[PDB]
Amino acid sequence: PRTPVLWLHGLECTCCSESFIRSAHPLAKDVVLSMISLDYDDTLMAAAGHQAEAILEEIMTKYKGNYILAVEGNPPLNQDGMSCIIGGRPFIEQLKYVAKDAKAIISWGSCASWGCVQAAKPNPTQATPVHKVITDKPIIKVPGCPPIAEVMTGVITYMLTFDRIPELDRQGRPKMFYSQRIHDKCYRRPHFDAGQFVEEWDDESARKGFCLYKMGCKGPTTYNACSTTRWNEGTSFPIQSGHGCIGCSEDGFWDKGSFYDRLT
Amino acid sequence: SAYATQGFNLDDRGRRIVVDPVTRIEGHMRCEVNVDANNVIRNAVSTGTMWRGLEVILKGRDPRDAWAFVERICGVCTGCHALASVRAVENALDIRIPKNAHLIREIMAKTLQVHDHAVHFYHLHALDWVDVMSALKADPKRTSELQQLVSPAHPLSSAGYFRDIQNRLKRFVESGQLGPFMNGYWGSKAYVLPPEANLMAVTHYLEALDLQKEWVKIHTIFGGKNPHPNYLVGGVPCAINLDGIGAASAPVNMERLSFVKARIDEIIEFNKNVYVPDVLAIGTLYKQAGWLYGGGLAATNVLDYGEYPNVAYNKSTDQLPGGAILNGNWDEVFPVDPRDSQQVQEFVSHSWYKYADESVGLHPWDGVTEPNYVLGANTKGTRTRIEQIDESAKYSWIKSPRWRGHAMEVGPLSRYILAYAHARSGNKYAERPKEQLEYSAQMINSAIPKALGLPETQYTLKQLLPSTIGRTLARALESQYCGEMMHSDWHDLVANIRAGDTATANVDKWDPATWPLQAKGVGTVAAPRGALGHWIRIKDGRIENYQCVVPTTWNGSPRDYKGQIGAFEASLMNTPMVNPEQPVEILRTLHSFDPCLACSTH
Numbered sequence: 001p002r003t004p005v006l007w008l009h010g011l012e013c014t015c016c017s018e019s020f021i022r023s024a025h026p027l028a029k030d031v032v033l034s035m036i037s038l039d040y041d042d043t044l045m046a047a048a049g050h051q052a053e054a055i056l057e058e059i060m061t062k063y064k065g066n067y068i069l070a071v072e073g074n075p076p077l078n079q080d081g082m083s084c085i086i087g088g089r090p091f092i093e094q095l096k097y098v099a100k101d102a103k104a105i106i107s108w109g110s111c112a113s114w115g116c117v118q119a120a121k122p123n124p125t126q127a128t129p130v131h132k133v134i135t136d137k138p139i140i141k142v143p144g145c146p147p148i149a150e151v152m153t154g155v156i157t158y159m160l161t162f163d164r165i166p167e168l169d170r171q172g173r174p175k176m177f178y179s180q181r182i183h184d185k186c187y188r189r190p191h192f193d194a195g196q197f198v199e200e201w202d203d204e205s206a207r208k209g210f211c212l213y214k215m216g217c218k219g220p221t222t223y224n225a226c227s228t229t230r231w232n233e234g235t236s237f238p239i240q241s242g243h244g245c246i247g248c249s250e251d252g253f254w255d256k257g258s259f260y261d262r263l264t
Numbered sequence: 265s266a267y268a269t270q271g272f273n274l275d276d277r278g279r280r281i282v283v284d285p286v287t288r289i290e291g292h293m294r295c296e297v298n299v300d301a302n303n304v305i306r307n308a309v310s311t312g313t314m315w316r317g318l319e320v321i322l323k324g325r326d327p328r329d330a331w332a333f334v335e336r337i338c339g340v341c342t343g344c345h346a347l348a349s350v351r352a353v354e355n356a357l358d359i360r361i362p363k364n365a366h367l368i369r370e371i372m373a374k375t376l377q378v379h380d381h382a383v384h385f386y387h388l389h390a391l392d393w394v395d396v397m398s399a400l401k402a403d404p405k406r407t408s409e410l411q412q413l414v415s416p417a418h419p420l421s422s423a424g425y426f427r428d429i430q431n432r433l434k435r436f437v438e439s440g441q442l443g444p445f446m447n448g449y450w451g452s453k454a455y456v457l458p459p460e461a462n463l464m465a466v467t468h469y470l471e472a473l474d475l476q477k478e479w480v481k482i483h484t485i486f487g488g489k490n491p492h493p494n495y496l497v498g499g500v501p502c503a504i505n506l507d508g509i510g511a512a513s514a515p516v517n518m519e520r521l522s523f524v525k526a527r528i529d530e531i532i533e534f535n536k537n538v539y540v541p542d543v544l545a546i547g548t549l550y551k552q553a554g555w556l557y558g559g560g561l562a563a564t565n566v567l568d569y570g571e572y573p574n575v576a577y578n579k580s581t582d583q584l585p586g587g588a589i590l591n592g593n594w595d596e597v598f599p600v601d602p603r604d605s606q607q608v609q610e611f612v613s614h615s616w617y618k619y620a621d622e623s624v625g626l627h628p629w630d631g632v633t634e635p636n637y638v639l640g641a642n643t644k645g646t647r648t649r650i651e652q653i654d655e656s657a658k659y660s661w662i663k664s665p666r667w668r669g670h671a672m673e674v675g676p677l678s679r680y681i682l683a684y685a686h687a688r689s690g691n692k693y694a695e696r697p698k699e700q701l702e703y704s705a706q707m708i709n710s711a712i713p714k715a716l717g718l719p720e721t722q723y724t725l726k727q728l729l730p731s732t733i734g735r736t737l738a739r740a741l742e743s744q745y746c747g748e749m750m751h752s753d754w755h756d757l758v759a760n761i762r763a764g765d766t767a768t769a770n771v772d773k774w775d776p777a778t779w780p781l782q783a784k785g786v787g788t789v790a791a792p793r794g795a796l797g798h799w800i801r802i803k804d805g806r807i808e809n810y811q812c813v814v815p816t817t818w819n820g821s822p823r824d825y826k827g828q829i830g831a832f833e834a835s836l837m838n839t840p841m842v843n844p845e846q847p848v849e850i851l852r853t854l855h856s857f858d859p860c861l862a863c864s865t866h
C-alpha cells in the first residue's frame with residue numbers, strides 16, 4: 001500500500017506544485033501512480049467542496065500516524081485568519097487539524113519554510129511559516145522559491161524508501177540537498193577567484209560569463225543545489241543564465257536589501 | 265431578493281449550494297449558487313478566498329527589484345507578472361530595450377502560453393469532461409480507431425499502447441487508493457463521452473504530464489529556472505556569445521539557441537497533433553449532447569489590451585489585436601487605453617477593501633489596497649465559520665475591475681472574438697486566428713460529426729463561441745497560435761544576432777541617479793488568462809504606488825457599485841445541474857476560465 005500524502009495549500013503562488021511536476025528523476029507521474037497516494041491536493045484532485053473535505057477525514061482515520069502532510073504556502077494570522085479561507089474557516093484551522101495525526105510534515109518552499117513574499121515587510125496578513133504554528137511535530141523544511149524539482153521528489157523518495165526523515169541541519173533542511181552554498185561549486189567561481197566580474201549588464205564580462213558578485217549575486221550566502229543539480233534536468237540555473245542568485249532559499253531574502261546590491 | 269442586471273434575472277430564493285474549496289484551480293475560491301425547482305442555476309456568487317497584499321509590500325522598494333516580487337504573485341502564469349513589471353518600469357523611465365531582449369521576452373511569453381494552456385486543459389480541466397472510470401470500459405482497438413480518426417498524424421495510436429495505458433489505470437484503481445480520482449463524480453449523467461474517448465483523453469493526460477516539463481526548458485535557458493525565471497529592467501540577463509571566447513560559459517550561445525528551437529518544434533507538434541484535436545473532438549461530442557451553456561459575458565462584452573506586435577512598438581501590428589466589444593456588436597471594436605483614468609477602474613463595493621468613496625471606481629494609478637474583512641448582516645455563520653456568504657455586502661478578496669463602467673470577460677476567448685472582429689474589419693494581422701476559428705467551426709459542425717456518424721449542425725461562430733465549449737476551444741487555438749508565433753520569433757532572433765546585433769540590455773538608465781524624480785508607468789501583457797496590467801508610480805527612486813489588475817481579477821470579480829455581475833457569475837447563470845450537490849457543471853464552466861486565484865487577489 002502506497003503512503004498517503006495530504007498536500008495542503010495556504011497562502012501561496014503554487015510555484016512549488018509546478019516545480020514538483022517538472023521532476024525528471026523520478027517522474028511526477030511515477031511518484032503519483034506508483035510511490036505515494038496523493039489523496040488531497042487542490043491543484044489536481046477530482047473532488048471539490050464537501051467531497052474534497054470528506055477525503056481528509058477518511059484518510060486521517062484509516063492512516064492515522066501514517067500519512068505525510070505536505071504544506072505549500074502558509075497560514076495568515078491577521079484578518080482573523082480569513083485572508084486564507086477553506087471550507088468557510090481559517091486555513092490555520094485546517095492546518096492544525098490535519099497536522100495532528102501526520103507521520104511527518106514537509107514544508108514545501110520558502111512560503112511554508114520561512115514566509116516568502118507575503119511575509120516580506122510589512123506582512124499585511126501576518127503570514128507565518130508552518131513550524132511557528134505547528135510546534136509538536138517533526139517538520140522538514142525544503143526552502144527555495146520554488147525548490148528544485150529533483151530536490152522535492154528526492155525528499156519524498158528518501159522518506160518513502162527509508163520510512164525516516166533525512167538528516168537535517170540546524171535550520172531543519174535536508175543536508176543531502178542543502179549542505180553546500182551556491183558559491184562552493186558555481187562554475188563561475190574561477191572568475192570570482194581571479195577578480196573577473198560583470199560590472200554592467202551585457203558588458204564584455206557578461207558575454208564571457210564572468211562572476212555576478214558585483215551585480216548582487218547572493219550565491220556566497222545561499223544554501224541550495226542550484227550549481228550542481230541545477231534546474232529543469234540540469235538545463236541551466238540562475239547564474240548560468242546571467243542573473244545573480246537572489247538568495248531565494250534563505251530565510252527573509254526579500255528584506256535583505258536590493259537584489260542588485262552586492263554582499264559586503 | 266431577485267433583481268435583473270445585464271439581461272440576467274438573478275434570483276436568490278432557490279436552494280443554496282456551496283462549493284468550498286473549488287479545486288483544480290490555482291489558489292483559493294469559494295462558489296455559492298442558488299438553483300430553481302428544476303435544478304437550474306439562477307444566482308451565482310464568486311468569492312476569492314485568499315489575499316497576500318503584494319501591492320502593499322512593494323511600497324518603498326526599488327523599481328528594479330519589483331519584477332521579482334510580483335513574479336511571485338503566481339507560479340502557474342510564471343513570468344507574465346515579471347514581464348508586466350519590467351514593462352511598467354521601462355515605461356515610467358523611458359527605457360528602450362534592445363531587439364534581442366524584446367524577442368527573448370516574446371519567446372518566453374509564448375512558451376508560458378503553451379505550457380499554461382496545455383497543462384490547464386489536461387491536468388485541471390479534462391476531468392470535468394472525461395470520466396476516468398468509463399475509460400476502464402473502453403475497447404483498446406476502438407480507442408486506436410478513434411485516435412486515428414481524431415488525429416491521424418499522432419504516432420502514439422496502436423491498440424497495444426492504449427491497452428497498456430488502460431491496464432496501468434486498472435491496477436491503480438483496483439488498489440483501492442484512487443489518489444487524485446478519490447471521491448470523484450464518475451458515472452454522473454453529466455459525463456457524455458464514450459469509453460474510447462475517455463481512454464484516449466486519459467492517455468493524453470499522462471502524455472502531457474511527461475511532455476510539459478520539456479517545454480519549460482526554453483524558460484530555463486533564457487531565465488535560469490522554471491518556475492520563476494529571471495527578468496531584467498532594461499532587457500534580459502541572458503547575454504549572447506554565439507561561438508566567441510567564453511561562449512561555453514555564456515547564457516546564450518548557438519548550441520543553446522538550437523536547443524530552444526528543438527523545444528519549439530516539439531511544441532508545434534503537440535499542439536497540432538494532440539491538444540487541438542482532443543478539444544475539437546470533446547467539444548463536438550458535448551455540442552452534440554447540447555451542452556452549450558456557460559457563455560456569460562462572452563456573448564456581449566469582451567476586452568484585451570492587445571499584444572505581440574509584428575513590428576516592435578507599433579501597436580497597429582499586434583498579432584493578437586485588442587480593444588473592447590460591447591453588447592455583442594462584433595462590428596465595432598473600441599480602442600482600450602490603459603492610461604485613461606476613465607477606462608480601466610476598480611470598485612470595492614462588494615470586496616473586502618476600503619476606499620474613501622466606494623461609489624466610484626479607481627484607475628490603477630490612483631488605486632488603493634487597504635484590507636477590510638467584514639461580513640454582511642445576512643451572513644449565515646460567523647466571521648470565522650461562514651456557512652452562507654452574504655453577496656449583498658462585501659464577499660470577496662477580489663476587486664471589481666470595469667471598463668468605462670462595463671463588466672467584461674477577458675481571456676483567450678475574448679482575444680479570439682476580438683481577433684475575429686478585427687480580421688472582419690480588414691485587419692490582416694489577425695488572419696491566423698480567424699482561419700483557426702473557421703476551421704474549428706467546420707470541424708465541430710460538420711467534419712467530426714460526419715467522421716463519427718453523427719448529425720451535422722449549423723452553429724455560427726456567434727452562437728458557438730460564447731459558451732464553455734467555445735472558451736475551452738479558444739484556449740487550445742491560442743496555444744497553437746503562440747507556438748507558431750514563437751517559431752517565427754526564434755528565426756528573427758537568430759537572424760538579428762547573425763547580422764551583428766548581439767545586444768541584450770540597455771543600461772543607460774540602470775543607475776537611479778539618472779531617473780526623473782517622479783514618474784508613472786504602465787505595462788500590459790496578454791497573459792494566459794487575459795488582460796494583465798501593472799501600474800506604477802515612482803518617487804525619489806522608490807515605489808510610491810504599485811497596482812495590479814490581473815485577468816482573474818476581471819473574470820472572478822464580485823459585483824460592482826451598480827450591482828453588475830462579473831464573468832464567472834454570469835457564466836454559471838442558467839445552467840442546469842444533473843445533481844445539485846455534485847458540482848460537475850459548476851466546475852466545468854468555472855474551469856473554462858482557468859481561474860488563478862492567487863493572481864486575482866495578489
Ligand code: SF4
Nearest residue numbers: 183186211212217219
Ligand atoms: S556568480 Fe555568484 S555564486 Fe557564482 S562565483 Fe560569482 S558570486 Fe559566487
Ligand code: F3S
Nearest residue numbers: 224226245246247248
Ligand atoms: S535565487 Fe534561488 S533558485 Fe537557486 S540560484 Fe539562488 S537559490
Ligand SMILES: [Cl-]
Nearest residue numbers: 114116251252
Ligand atoms: Cl522568506
Ligand SMILES: [Mg+2]
Nearest residue numbers: 319811812813
Ligand atoms: Mg490589484
